[PDB]
């Protein structure tokens, strides 16, 4: 019993974290095989960040301008190149701790674990979701740039996020490991803002199924709804639309609890229109949307890595 | 910016998890140096769990009755002894992945990370707190016994909890790493129940200071309170009494934000009376009590927004 916001074990990723320094700027790097990946803004001064020409800034650097530290060992940089908003530093030593890995680009609603790092040293691990407005609600201070997000599939680490910046609302923006930003963001000190966010509907439904599995059933009702009527309701409350794909993905949870997906949608409709009435679900007075259907199945079945 | 329920990176603990088998029972063990620590109930059958005589069950075992598996390698047991409710299995190989460690017994209100394991394999990491009734609200399934709780302040792992059982309310009970239970619990299937739980007041106060540091003040008021009047009101909401020790511990956060501890106590009194009126504090509609004063200082910025 119990239901917690659970992150993947971070060990395979901790063995890849390094410290990257270019002049006065120090941030985190991800060392896989003989390459260290880090945000390309490591080459910028505070003035350069206002309007950087990254190719022009990079051409002026040599391999020895980049200091890479792995624990108490200095790595030798033998090459450097840029891919989108990510700098790739070729080093003379392959990481002996390189796990089996993939680089994957995730979609809004998908969750992942973040290993927050400072000076190439991991400080914490938390779970979060890619919001529909492509930001993440992380917990990051100065020096956290280069911290990565990931999932684990059996013994394979799928790297999906690298931290680049904090927006004025305190939320975070970053890229996939190929340097492509999530969202309409750019890597420079200029006016940028997160768009209006929405709630991840399929994830709220998965979390309601998790509450039922844990004995919380007060919100269940005798009613059902059509998919179209539910989306008309959900659109009124800034909820993301529920597609037939989402209904298919919730099938296993629906069979396990005996509550049809549109039956659980009628519970969610009533919760939006009337509130919780002083009650909580899994210790929360808000409808939680940072657990996917897969996370619920994994936590309620004990899958190991 | 941001404030998340953050666990310590689990890598140092993942390298210590092993699978312990005694007959038909399989659970998790913690391998440090040449000793594997696990719950003593691994020697029990389901027919022994009501009134087990552990000394009598243990004397009938030899070293070769204990099967210890570390990854795909079978460890050789060369000794066994019981210390309180933990079994200590001496093995012929010291763990090469043994981190710098300590065994610490924690007090109610203290937080720690849990690395949930099944069959000696880590499945997830979450943060939690020792409740005032000595239980923990974990997320554990059958086979999770022997999973450990820990803190990693600096480079040293302080092991503080080993999981033993789930109570009828779905909450969990366990021991320190010397096998002494937290709370009035015994490792028997006899009728046992968690006492009425309370909210960890010093932790809610620390979390209100974290909200101020991150830029939020809507909940403050022009009032102060005596420590005695605050406790008379707090106890009516099932809040733990706030001692002078707690007021002293909140001193650094009080100096950083400019809000005296008894002024923050007045704001908490008003919050308990009024609720949140549709507002949230750090993304929550409930008052959070699983962040200690020390956790807030570790996670938050040193500069108040
Ligand atoms: O004032 C600045 C300067 N700051 C630097 C850096 C950046 O955002 N870094 C950070 C990341 N994550 C958390 C942080 C917490 C506190 C301070 C900096 C953080 C950046 C990176 C990029 Cl790609 C574009 C612009 C900026 C940019 O403005 N800080 C941001 C907060 C406001
Ligand atoms: O049905 C039982 C049998 N069960 C076995 C075991 C125990 O509590 N194991 C477990 C731990 N953590 C989470 C679990 C989740 C589901 C099932 C077992 C779990 C135990 C250990 C000890 Cl030391 C004392 C009593 C018991 C004991 O009653 N109790 C469970 C239903 C709550
Ligand atoms: Cl303590």
Q: Cα–Cα distances in Å, from B78 out to B35, B62, B93?
A: 10, 9, 10
Q: Do B118 and A304 touch (CB under 8 A)?
A: yes
Q: Do A214 and B170 touch (CB under 8 A)?
A: yes
Angle between the B201-213 and B261-274 helix axes, to the nearest 10 degrees? 100
Burial track B35-60 (b if 16+ CB lie within 10 A, e otherwise): bbbbbbbbbbeeebeeebebeebeee
Long-range contacts of A58-66 (CB under 8 A, 24+ apart): A58/A82, A58/A87, A61/A22, A65/A22, A65/A23, A66/A20, A66/A21, A66/A22
Nearest alpha-carbon partner for A83 in A68, A103, A69, A101: A103
Which residues in A lie closer than 8 A to residue B7 (C-beta atoms)?
Answer: 7, 124-126
Q: How far is the CA of B178 from the centre of ligand 1 (A)?
A: 45
Angle between the A261-274 and A201-213 helix axes, to the nearest 10 degrees? 100
Under 8 Å between Cβ of B128 and A7: no
Substitution site in B166, B171, B188 for ligand 2 pocket (most atoms within 8 Å of beta carbon): B166
Residue listed under structure tokens 């931290």: A163
CATH class of the domain at A15-99: mainly beta
- Residue A165 Cβ inside 6 Å of ligand 1? The answer reads yes
* Known catalytic residue at A117: no
Under 8 Å between Cβ of A13 and A100: no
Nearest to A126 among B7, B138, B283 (CB): B7
User: What is the C-alpha to C-alpha distance for residues B239 and B233, in angstroms, rounded to an integer?
Assistant: 9
Residue listed under structure tokens 């200082």: B297
Q: Cα–Cα distances in Å, from A227 out to A53, A195, A230, A239, A269?
A: 49, 27, 5, 14, 12
Radius of gyration of chain B (CA): 22
Q: What is the sign, positive or negative, of the torsion defined by CA atoms of A68, A70, A71, A72? A: negative
Resolution for the entry shown, Å = 1.7
Count of beta carbons in the 10 Å neighbourhood of residue A60:
8
Strands B111-118 and A66-70, by their bridges, are unpaired
Per DSSP, which regions of chain A are E strands? 17-22, 25-32, 35-39, 66-70, 73-75, 77-83, 86-91, 100-103, 111-118, 121-129, 148-153, 156-166, 172-175
Q: How far is the CA of B4 from the centre of ligand 2 (A)?
A: 30
Residue listed under structure tokens 């239901």: A3
Question: What distance, in Å, lies between the first and last C-alpha atoms of chain A?
Answer: 20
Whether the domain at B1-14+100-197 and the domain at B15-99 fall into the same CATH topology: yes
Q: Please compute, for residue B246, the number of CA atoms within 13 A of its CA located in the half-sphere on the CB side.
A: 22
Locate B98 and state its tokens.
Answer: 């043994």
Q: Which residues line ligand 2 (CB under 6 A)?
A: A 1; B 41, 49, 140-142, 144-145, 164-166, 172, 187, 189
Residue listed under structure tokens 């794909």: A245
In 3-state terms, what secondary structure has residue A160? strand
Under 8 Å between Cβ of B230 and B265: yes
Which residues in A lie closer than 8 A to residue B299 (C-beta atoms)?
Answer: 124, 139
Phi, psi (deg, nearest 5) at residue B168: -60, -25
Q: Where are the domains of chain A?
A: 1-14+100-197, 15-99, 198-301
Substitution site in B142, B186, B187 for ligand 2 pocket (most atoms within 8 Å of beta carbon): B142
Where does residue B142 rank: exposed (0-12), middle (13-18), buried (19+ CB within 10 A)? exposed
CATH architecture of A1-14+100-197: Beta Barrel (2.40)
Angle between the B227-235 and B261-274 helix axes, to the nearest 10 degrees? 30
User: What is the C-alpha to C-alpha distance for residues B305 and B299, in angstroms, rounded to an integer?
Assistant: 14
Residue listed under structure tokens 């009527």: A229
Give one DSSP letter per residue of chain B, joined into a string. ------BPP-HHHHTTEEEEEETTEEEEEEEETTEEEEEGGGG--TTTSSS--HHHHHHT--GGGEEEEETTEEEPEEEEEEETTEEEEEESS--TT--SEEE----TT-EEEEEEEETTEEEEEEEEE--TTS-B-----TT-TT-EEEE-STT-EEEEEEEEEE-TTS-EEEE-TTSPBSSS--SSSS---PPPP-B-HHHHHHHHHHHHHTT--TT--S----HHHHHHHHHTTTBPPPPHHHHHHTHHHHHHHT--HHHHHHHHHHHHHH--TT--BTTBSS---S--HHHHHHHS-SS--
Nearest alpha-carbon partner for B123 in A148, A103, A154: A154
Residue listed under structure tokens 């923050």: B264
Q: Please compute, for residue B268, the number of CA atoms within 13 A of its CA located in the half-sphere on the CB side.
A: 36
User: What is the C-alpha to C-alpha distance for residues B297 and B303, in angstroms, rounded to an integer?
Assistant: 11
Interface of B with A in 57-116 (CB under 8 A): 115-116
* Known catalytic residue at A41: yes
User: What is the C-alpha to C-alpha distance for residues A270 and A219, in angstroms, rounded to an integer?
Assistant: 8
Under 8 Å between Cβ of B49 and B41: yes
User: What is the C-alpha to C-alpha distance for residues A253 and A259, in angstroms, rounded to an integer?
Assistant: 8
Domain spanning A198-301: CATH 1.10.1840.10: yes
User: What is the C-alpha to C-alpha distance for residues B15 and B156, in angstroms, rounded to an integer?
Assistant: 14
Nearest to A138 among B2, B138, B144 (CB): B2
Which residue's C-alpha comes closest to atom 3 of ligand 2?
B189
Asked if B8 has any chain A CB less than 8 Å from its own CB, the reply is: yes
Which residues in A lie closer than 8 A to residue B200 (C-beta atoms)?
Answer: none
Beta bridge mates, A148 = A115, A162
Beta bridge mates, B127 = B113
Cα B203 from chain centre: 14
User: What is the C-alpha to C-alpha distance for residues B115 and B11, in angstroms, rounded to an integer?
Assistant: 10
Q: Which residues contact A259 (CB under 8 A, 6 or more apart)?
A: A209, A212, A220
Nearest alpha-carbon partner for B14 in A56, A7, A130, A291: A7
Q: Which residues contact B274 (CB under 8 A, 6 or more apart)?
A: none
Interface of A with B in 118-147 (CB under 8 A): 122-126, 128, 137-141
How far off is chain A from B211, nearest CA to CA, in Å? Answer: 12
């Amino acid at each position: 019993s119990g239901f917690r916001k659970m992150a993947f074990p971070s060990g395979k990723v901790e063995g890849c974290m390094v410290q990257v320094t270019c002049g006065t700027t120090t941030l985190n790097g991800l060392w896989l095989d003989d390459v260290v990946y880090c945000p390309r803004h490591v080459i910028c001064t505070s003035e350069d960040m206002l309007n950087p020409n990254y190719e022009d800034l990079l051409i002026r650097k040599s391999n020895h301008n980049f200091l890479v530290q792995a624990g108490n060992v200095q790595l030798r940089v033998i090459g450097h190149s840029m891919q989108n908003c990510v700098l790739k530093l070729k080093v003379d030593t392959a990481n002996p701790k390189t796990p089996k890995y993939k680089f994957v680009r995730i979609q809004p609603g998908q969750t992942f674990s973040v290993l927050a790092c400072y000076n190439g040293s991991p400080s914490g691990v938390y779970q979060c979701a890619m919001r529909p407005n492509f930001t993440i609600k992380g917990s990051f201070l100065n020096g956290s740039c280069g911290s990565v997000g990931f999932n684990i599939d059996y013994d394979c680490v799928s790297f999906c996020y690298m931290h680049h910046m904090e927006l004025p609302t305190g939320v975070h923006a970053g890229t996939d490991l190929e340097g492509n930003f999530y969202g309409p963001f750019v890597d420079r000190q200029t006016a940028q803002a997160a768009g209006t966010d929405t709630t991840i509907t399929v994830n709220v439904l998965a979390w309601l199924y998790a509450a039922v599995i844990n004995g919380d059933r007060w919100f269940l009702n005798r009613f059902t709804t059509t998919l179209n009527d539910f989306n008309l309701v959900a659109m009124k409350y800034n909820y993301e639309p529920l597609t037939q794909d989402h209904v298919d993905i919730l099938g296993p949870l629906s069979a396990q609890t005996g509550i049809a997906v549109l039956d659980m949608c009628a519970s969610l409709k009533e919760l939006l229109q009337n509130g919780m009435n002083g009650r909580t679900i899994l210790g929360s007075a808000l409808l939680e949307d940072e657990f996917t259907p897969f996370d619920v199945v994994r936590q309620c079945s004990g899958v190991t890595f």
